Write an enzyme that holds these catalytic residues in place. Structure first.
Site, PDB file in Angstrom:
ATOM      1  N   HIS A   1       1.287  -1.420   0.096  1.00  0.00           N
ATOM      2  CA  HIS A   1      -0.397  -0.175  -0.031  1.00  0.00           C
ATOM      3  C   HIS A   1       1.150   0.903  -0.010  1.00  0.00           C
ATOM      4  O   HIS A   1       2.376   1.302   0.735  1.00  0.00           O
ATOM      5  CB  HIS A   1      -0.668  -0.182   1.323  1.00  0.00           C
ATOM      6  CG  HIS A   1      -1.562  -1.138   1.287  1.00  0.00           C
ATOM      7  ND1 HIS A   1      -3.361  -1.684   0.448  1.00  0.00           N
ATOM      8  CD2 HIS A   1      -1.289  -2.469   2.268  1.00  0.00           C
ATOM      9  CE1 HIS A   1      -3.469  -2.342   0.944  1.00  0.00           C
ATOM     10  NE2 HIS A   1      -3.283  -3.236   1.709  1.00  0.00           N
TER      11      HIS A   1
ATOM     12  N   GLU B   1      -0.699   2.100   6.253  1.00  0.00           N
ATOM     13  CA  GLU B   1      -2.469   2.557   6.832  1.00  0.00           C
ATOM     14  C   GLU B   1      -3.012   2.480   7.964  1.00  0.00           C
ATOM     15  O   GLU B   1      -3.315   3.665   8.778  1.00  0.00           O
ATOM     16  CB  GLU B   1      -3.020   0.914   5.763  1.00  0.00           C
ATOM     17  CG  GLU B   1      -3.146   0.377   4.824  1.00  0.00           C
ATOM     18  CD  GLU B   1      -4.067  -0.266   4.197  1.00  0.00           C
ATOM     19  OE1 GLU B   1      -4.025  -1.858   5.139  1.00  0.00           O
ATOM     20  OE2 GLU B   1      -5.613  -0.144   3.979  1.00  0.00           O
TER      21      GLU B   1
HETATM   22 ZN   LIG Z   1      -2.867  -5.594   2.871  1.00  0.00          ZN
END
Ligand SMILES: [Zn+2]
Length: 262
Positions: A95, A105
């Protein structure tokens, strides 16, 4: 389903994070913000043991339209780290974003990093549970998360992966990256001693709450250009008009849960 950024520029309908279905609206979700100082220390959280992480090998990596993911095919496993049993590696993905302060995140004391890496594993054998309990075991899947930040040196261990990106710009594409070992990605084993632990869910639909999370405090370092490679070579759409970035789920509330560390 979509991430906010792509929903705005997409040419067709799609559910944004707040409107996701499944168990995405429940009470034990991830990611969360970790207040390092409120996490209780626990001695039972020993070091981890890796098997297969060191053997060079070719991997199949693909663009699933949501992220870059390489299949691990049960060809490696982990134990220790307080885990009740061995877990075998299924897949890995990342990500990221183009801005250094908004690519991860999870966050530590409110700080977000350049990227975040998730190595998904599943419990080895099946253990007997009662029908009366929750359908899925809360520690069914075990993911290892690494935070990424920019550095001066070019990270040679990530080079093979970075190269492979060129061959999979559009969704559904695949390729074979040069021979490398999973150990080439992570930081030196001595830095992997401290980490945070807590039960949660997956960060994508259906957001099943059967994950035992592990976030190491030591960030992996990559050259800025290496990080930008992801945003520059990957796209969300087949038309190659929308770059793949900001594929992160907005934070969730900790709630009744507590976090522990080593
Ligand atoms: Zn993930």
């Amino acid at each position: 389903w979509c991430y906010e950024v792509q929903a705005e520029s997409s040419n067709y309908p799609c559910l944004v994070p707040v409107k996701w279905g499944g168990n995405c609206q429940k009470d034990r979700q991830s990611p969360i913000n970790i207040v390092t100082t409120k996490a209780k220390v626990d001695k039972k959280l020993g070091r981890f043991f890796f098997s297969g992480y060191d053997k060079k090998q070719t991997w199949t990596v693909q663009n699933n339209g949501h992220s870059v993911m390489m299949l691990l095919e049960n060809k490696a496993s982990i134990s220790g780290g307080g885990l009740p049993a061995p877990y075998q590696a299924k897949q890995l993905h990342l990500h990221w974003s183009d801005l250094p302060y908004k690519g991860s995140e999870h966050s530590l004391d409110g700080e977000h990093f350049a990227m975040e890496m998730h190595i998904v594993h599943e419990k080895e054998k099946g253990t007997s549970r009662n029908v009366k309990e929750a359908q899925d075991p809360e520690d069914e899947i075990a993911v290892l998360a690494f935070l990424v930040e920019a550095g001066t040196q070019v990270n040679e261990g990530f080079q093979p992966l970075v190269e492979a990106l060129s061959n999979i710009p559009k969704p559904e594409m695949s390729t074979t990256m040069a021979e490398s070992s999973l150990l080439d990605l992570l930081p030196k084993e001595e830095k992997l001693r401290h980490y945070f632990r807590y039960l949660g869910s997956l960060t994508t639909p259906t957001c099943d709450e059967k994950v035992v999370w592990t976030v190491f405090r030591e960030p992996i370092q990559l050259h800025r250009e290496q990080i930008l490679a992801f945003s520059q070579k990957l796209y969300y759409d087949k038309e190659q008009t929308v770059s793949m970035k900001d594929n992160v789920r907005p934070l969730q509330q900790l709630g009744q849960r507590t976090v522990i560390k080593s």
